[PDB]
Design a binder for these strands. Structure first.
Ligand code: K
Ligand code: MG
Ligand code: MG
Ligand code: MG
Ligand code: MG
Ligand code: MG
Ligand code: MG
Ligand code: MG
Ligand code: MG
Ligand code: MG
Ligand code: MG
Ligand code: MG
Ligand code: MG
Ligand code: MG
Ligand code: MG
Ligand code: MG
Ligand code: NA
Lengths: 214, 144, 203, 215, 98
RNA sequence: AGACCUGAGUGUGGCAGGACCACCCGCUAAACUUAAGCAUAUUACUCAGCGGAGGAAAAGAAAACAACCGUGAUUCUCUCAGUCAGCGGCGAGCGAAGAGGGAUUCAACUCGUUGCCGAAUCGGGUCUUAUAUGACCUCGAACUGUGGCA
RNA sequence: AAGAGAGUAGCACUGUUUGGGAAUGCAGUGUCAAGCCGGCAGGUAUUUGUCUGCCAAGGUUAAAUAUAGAG
């Protein structure tokens, strides 16, 4: 709040053959008599300084938030929309993809990689691996040095049994009890590739309800 | 967002829509509601006729919890009944009992055509409402 | 007991005998210094009522203050600005003389802690109060569970911050409820509460 | 040009905004999610330390004042002395076994007292009350088996001992009698209301009429 | 035994029906009781110190027979009509008992 | 010649003084500005000035609300509420409180006074591994009342 | 069986402060209580009679709160 205004500056007035901008007092510094306090002056105060009570956050209606999550889920069941978003699902047996519950008992990362290759989901994780690169612009100076694309998302009935799937680059884990719209539609575009476990798949009817049953 | 404002469209117009004559100066006509009876009189009299002056008695230390008294009409009573109980209420049979206090109502008014007989518990009631509910086949029970 | 007779006698300050005693005492006080140390309080029943005990570490002083209103210290009586701010002789101080006597003793003897005070005498130009003080470094004070709370550093110069009985009086803290809503924690704290602009995260 | 607008009363004429010359007077809530985590962490730590005591002490049930909230019930500050005497517990002792005591509250009714007495009797039967020293147990103290079989109440309201608040039940559907179908309820209510409203005017009329009887 | 209420919102004894209970005794009710020992102590002191200049003026007015003027004098000094009436009664008693 | 009261000198053991001052407590205290002029009003019980603490400070245990089917120390938050409360050249403008949902909460104690006792108290010295809430001594303080019980 | 804080509370004048309006709080001076039918409060002034809630003029006290140019 004090930036650019910590000077005892004053306008010289008219009759001295100079502009009427405020000028710095004193002498013997090469700064004396220079312009001050103006948004057009060097070392001056900026126009409309930014404040911290700007409205950073937003409110959204509860029903509208639930509407968006439902719509983004229905889009993930259409293979045309999945391909249009950018995922590689040419080797996937069926959409939506549902696998057995045994993947929760894995403990070694090698087992997870073998499972991904079996169901044909390894093409998408390979696409994310190759896309890794250094960000362009000032962003690489602000703790955002690397960028990468979004791969498949694996949905589990709870927040357990994820030790073997963590550390795999290009894979995301989700909990069916709290689905995030920021993950279901990255960048605002629908059609994310989702792999379901059987236990999590069977809970969808109870969590969201039907057209007649609440 | 700053990219939808008129200022983006006005880059290069030199006047931003305020005119070569007249210009954009600071506080002509004064600040706030100044001049309500001098040089702004026509606006005030035309749009806010009852602004200047007093009216009525005063009430020191008003407690609005003492005057709480919401109202409901006779024609909206079925919105409080059970979803099943209506449509099978008859003249001389068992009838649902509605408590207005538990639903947040104080006085029962008598507008409209009653749709089903019932027994209503209320604090206050109008004379027309009492007549209509009695004719239909219901009753009013006073509660405090 | 004997307290009742002493208490009821001091409720007759307008009687002939009490006026005679006070008149002689006022003449004696007029010829002493502004601050005087006493061996014993002149109103022992009143002193014990406000927290004095006959024990080592307790002391009593008598302090003199000048009666009348306040005069604004403006050169030659000239005030500037709007006429609403004029006037040099008719305005009054916002704290009472009882607390002015306490603060004068406290600022003079910095090794003591002021406890309370009470009224003693008055005349046409002077007022006299007696102040009870405690020495916090004494062994008997530090080992007494009823008074050792005053040793803690949070009670330093409590009379300069208006925390005594006299200071509470002019702050409005004798009142409660609807008579003290705008000054109850403190006048400044209430003003800060009612005037700060609040920004919720999701407004 | 001003048109047809509301007259503004925005109330922003003091120095609240921080600038180069003013400190300002503002309050923001950027610490809201961090403080939410901190309060939960402290509650969890306190529960671990005081185990197995319940987090919340027992409290009574009271009626909300004013006609607007006449029909509601909530939790009070502490149990009254008359309630404690009826239950059979001393006030000072009751404070050591997690019962809140309020010496200012008065009953004024029997329905309220009976509810709160029942709460105390239910709680006293469910108490365990570990002995002071295990080697020598006193009278009315839980044995070792009850001590090891002990859990901690975590309910935010201490209802695991007694339960929720108690209100009268709703009325079932019934049949209308014939006094109910003939009585005029507005006539009955209005007459009672008028007795209080015109008490003074009626008294003056009677006094003047009585004064005209000096014969 | 407080009066039981009716069941309606208006009229005399209005309100919801309960079972009212009598007020409990308290230690605050010891006020308004006579204070015999306090009264006796005040009598001893009043004997010792005697009268005051204000009380002598009221004494003279009562002797002449100006009761209304005595009340006006007392009310100005004490600031309350109830306080003034108590002061006049006290002086009347003392004169009678002397 | 000797006590008591009041008042000095010296000696022994201690404390105060300055800094920091964002937040907090007490005092003192403007004008620019707005009112399209201006004097009451507003800016504002704010800036400048003086004094005083802490890790927080201040407040706190009803001479409180309410008028109900009644609540129950303090502090803070949403709301009550920019108020069909109220103040104001009734102009410009200003402006709270009870109640309700919550955060916190095993939260409360005490002196004087009244009644029964009447140095049982404090300081100093010595002893008990101990400047003990212990014991003994003390023409030291204290009956112009320190302590203990209700 | 007793008692519970007096130049204190109140009142008048003057000044200031408050949304507080026949006077919300406070300060100076004058005057100055009650407690064998007590005192204070109950948001329009006075006198009289009821009802309701509390019992001033001494003291200590964690947590939930601030850090708007500090360490
Ligand atoms: K006085
Ligand atoms: Mg500057
Ligand atoms: Mg710069
Ligand atoms: Mg123009
Ligand atoms: Mg022109
Ligand atoms: Mg913080
Ligand atoms: Mg200093
Ligand atoms: Mg410091
Ligand atoms: Mg300005
Ligand atoms: Mg102007
Ligand atoms: Mg001008
Ligand atoms: Mg300052
Ligand atoms: Mg403190
Ligand atoms: Mg203001
Ligand atoms: Mg008292
Ligand atoms: Mg304190
Ligand atoms: Na102008």
């Amino acid at each position: 709040r004090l930036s650019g205004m910590k000077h005892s500056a004053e306008s010289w007035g008219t009759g001295r053959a100079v502009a009427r901008i405020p000028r710095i007092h004193g002498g013997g510094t090469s700064m004396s008599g220079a312009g001050a306090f103006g948004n057009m002056c060097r070392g001056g105060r900026m126009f409309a300084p930014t404040k911290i009570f700007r409205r950073w956050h937003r409110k959204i209606n509860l029903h509208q938030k639930r509407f968006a999550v439902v719509s983004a889920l229905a889009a993930s069941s259409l293979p045309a929309l999945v391909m249009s978003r950018g995922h590689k699902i040419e080797n996937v047996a069926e959409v939506p993809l549902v696998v057995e519950d045994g993947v929760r008992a894995y403990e070694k990362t090698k087992e997870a990689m073998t499972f991904l290759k079996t169901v044909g989901a390894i093409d998408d994780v390979n696409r994310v691996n190759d896309s890794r690169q250094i960000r362009a612009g000032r962003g690489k100076m602000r703790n955002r040095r690397y960028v990468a694309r979004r791969g498949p998302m694996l949905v589990m009935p709870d927040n357990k049994g994820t030790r073997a799937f963590r550390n795999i680059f290009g894979l995301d884990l989700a909990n069916v009890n709290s689905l995030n719209l920021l993950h279901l539609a990255p960048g605002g575009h629908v059609g994310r590739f989702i792999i379901w476990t059987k236990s999590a798949f069977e809970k969808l009817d109870k969590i969201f309800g039907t057209f007649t049953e609440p | 967002p700053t990219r939808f404002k008129k200022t983006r469209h006005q880059r290069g117009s030199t006047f931003c829509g305020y005119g070569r004559v007249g210009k954009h100066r600071k506080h002509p006509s004064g600040r706030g509601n100044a001049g309500g009876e001098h040089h702004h009189r026509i606006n005030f009299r035309k749009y806010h006729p009852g602004y200047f002056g007093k009216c009525g008695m005063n009430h020191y230390h008003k407690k609005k919890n003492t005057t709480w008294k919401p109202t409901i009409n006779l024609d909206n009573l079925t919105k409080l009944m059970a979803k099943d109980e209506a449509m099978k209420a008859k003249k001389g049979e068992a009838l649902p009992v509605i408590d207005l206090l538990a639903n947040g109502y104080s006085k029962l008014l008598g507008n409209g055509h009653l749709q089903a007989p019932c027994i209503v518990k209320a604090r206050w009631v109008s004379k027309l409402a009492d007549k209509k509910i009695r004719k239909a086949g219901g009753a009013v029970v006073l509660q405090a | 007991g004997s307290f009742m007779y002493l208490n009821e006698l001091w409720k007759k300050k307008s009687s002939d005998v009490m006026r005679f005693i006070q008149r002689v005492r006022a003449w004696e006080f007029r010829h002493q210094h502004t601050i005087v140390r006493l061996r014993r309080p002149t109103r022992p029943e009143k002193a014990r009522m406000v927290g004095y005990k006959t024990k080592q570490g307790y002391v009593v002083f008598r302090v003199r203050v000048r009666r009348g209103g306040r005069k604004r210290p403006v050169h030659k009586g000239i005030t500037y600005g709007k006429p609403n701010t004029a006037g040099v002789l008719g305005r009054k101080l916002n704290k009472n003389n009882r607390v002015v006597a306490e603060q004068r003793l406290g600022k003079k003897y910095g090794n003591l802690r002021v406890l309370n005070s009470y009224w003693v005498n008055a005349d046409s130009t002077f007022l006299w109060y007696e102040v009870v003080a405690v020495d916090p470094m004494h062994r008997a004070i530090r080992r007494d569970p009823r008074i050792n709370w005053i040793v803690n550093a949070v009670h330093k110069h409590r009379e300069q911050r208006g925390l005594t009985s006299a200071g509470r009086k002019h702050r409005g803290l004798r009142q409660k409820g609807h008579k003290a809503s705008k000054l109850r924690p403190s006048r400044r704290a209430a003003w800060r509460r009612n005037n700060r602009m609040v920004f919720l995260r999701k407004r | 040009p001003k048109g047809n607008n509301a007259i503004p009363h925005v109330h922003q004429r003091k120095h609240w905004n921080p600038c180069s010359s003013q400190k300002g007077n503002v309050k923001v809530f950027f610490n809201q999610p961090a403080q939410k985590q901190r309060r939960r962490r402290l509650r969890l730590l306190k529960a671990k330390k005081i185990f197995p005591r319940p987090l919340k002490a027992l409290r009574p049930q009271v009626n909300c004042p004013t006609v607007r909230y006449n029909m509601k019930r909530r939790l009070g500050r502490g149990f009254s002395l008359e309630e404690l005497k009826a239950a059979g517990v001393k006030p000072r002792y009751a404070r050591t076994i997690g019962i809140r005591v309020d010496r200012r509250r008065k009953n004024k009714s029997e329905e309220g007292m009976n509810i709160n007495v029942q709460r105390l009797k239910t709680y006293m039967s469910k108490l365990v009350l570990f002995p002071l020293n295990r080697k020598k147990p006193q009278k009315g103290d839980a044995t070792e088996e009850e001590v090891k079989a002990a859990t901690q109440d975590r309910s935010r309201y201490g209802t695991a001992a007694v339960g929720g608040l108690v209100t009268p039940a709703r009325e079932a559907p019934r049949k209308v009698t014939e006094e109910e179908s003939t009585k005029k309820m507005y006539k009955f209510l209005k007459k009672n209301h008028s007795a209080v409203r015109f008490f003074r005017a009626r008294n003056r009329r009677a006094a003047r009429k009585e004064a005209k009887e000096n014969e | 035994a407080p009066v039981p209420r009716t069941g309606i919102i208006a009229g005399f004894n209005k309100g919801y029906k309960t079972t009212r209970r009598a007020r409990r005794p308290s230690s605050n009710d010891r006020y308004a009781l006579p204070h015999k020992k306090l009264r006796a102590v005040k009598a001893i002191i009043s004997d010792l110190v005697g009268f005051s200049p204000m009380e002598r003026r009221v004494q003279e007015l009562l002797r002449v027979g100006k009761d209304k003027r005595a009340l006006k004098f007392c009310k100005k000094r004490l600031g309350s009509i109830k306080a003034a009436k108590k002061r006049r009664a006290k002086v009347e008693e003392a004169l009678r008992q002397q």
